[PDB]
């Protein structure tokens, strides 16, 4: 392969990327080799023709975070006599996760959100969690 803009099939790629992503958010293991390759995938995706799959990758990632923070909302929703402490463990987790994604999506961050209301992958993660917190900020009566 080469650094030049390539003809690239999206879903073939967003699948393997997806497996790795959900791995990364919950702090489960990622083998470093495939981590390297995921970097190379987000590149190829960002440069591909006929139309650049930058934006599409952004929105697929955003839906992924919505489902995941809402799912965190539902998993911590199960009281377990433990709101907050559950909330906390999950937020520690999800935060280091968001950091590692911010790392992995670097090129999408630097070169695509120069175009522009879009925000960096990490920051986005944070807004999603700010709806997990805006929801119990309301349920505080």
């Amino acid at each position: 392969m080469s650094l030049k803009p390539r003809v690239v099939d999206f879903d073939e790629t967003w699948n393997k990327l997806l497996t790795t992503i959900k791995a990364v958010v919950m702090l489960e293991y990622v083998e470093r080799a495939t981590w390297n390759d995921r970097f190379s995938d987000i590149y190829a995706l960002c440069v591909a023709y006929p139309e650049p799959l930058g934006e599409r990758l952004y929105t697929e990632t955003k839906i992924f975070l919505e489902n995941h923070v809402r799912h965190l909302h539902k998993r911590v929703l199960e009281s377990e006599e433990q709101v907050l402490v559950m909330y906390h463990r999950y937020w520690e987790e999800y935060s280091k996760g968001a950091d590692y994604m911010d790392c992995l999506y670097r090129y999408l961050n630097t070169q695509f959100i120069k175009k522009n209301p879009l925000m960096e992958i990490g920051e986005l993660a944070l807004d999603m969690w700010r709806k997990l917190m805006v929801e119990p900020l309301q349920a505080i009566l």
């Binding site: 990364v24 293991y29 470093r32 390297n36 390759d37 190379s40 590149y43 790392c103 670097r106 630097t110």
Partner: protein
């Protein structure tokens, strides 16, 4: 101490780790993920960069480390015209 960068055609470049970190992309690659980045197995494989480009990238790393924060007269960084395009793409990709 040292990291091994692999070019697309299989060439191995061993450079000081601190130098390789000049690359935001490489810094990010080894930032991850981020556990057991100390299992003594540190290497990067670039399946998009040819050896004639990775060699210059490494020369840039050495150049970069030497002249930043040095009060010595800083010289121009040379780029042969036939590699200018490939280097631009590699520099873009590696973020350095």
């Amino acid at each position: 101490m040292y990291v091994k960068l692999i070019s697309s055609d299989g060439h191995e470049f061993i450079v000081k780790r601190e130098h390789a970190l000049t690359s935001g992309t490489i810094k990010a690659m080894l930032s991850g993920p981020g556990q057991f980045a100390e299992n003594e197995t540190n290497e990067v494989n670039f399946r998009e960069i040819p050896s004639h480009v990775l060699s210059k990238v490494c020369m840039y790393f050495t150049y970069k480390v030497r002249y930043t924060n040095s009060s010595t007269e800083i010289p121009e960084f040379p780029i042969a015209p036939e590699i200018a395009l490939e280097l631009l793409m590699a520099a873009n990709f590696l973020d350095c």
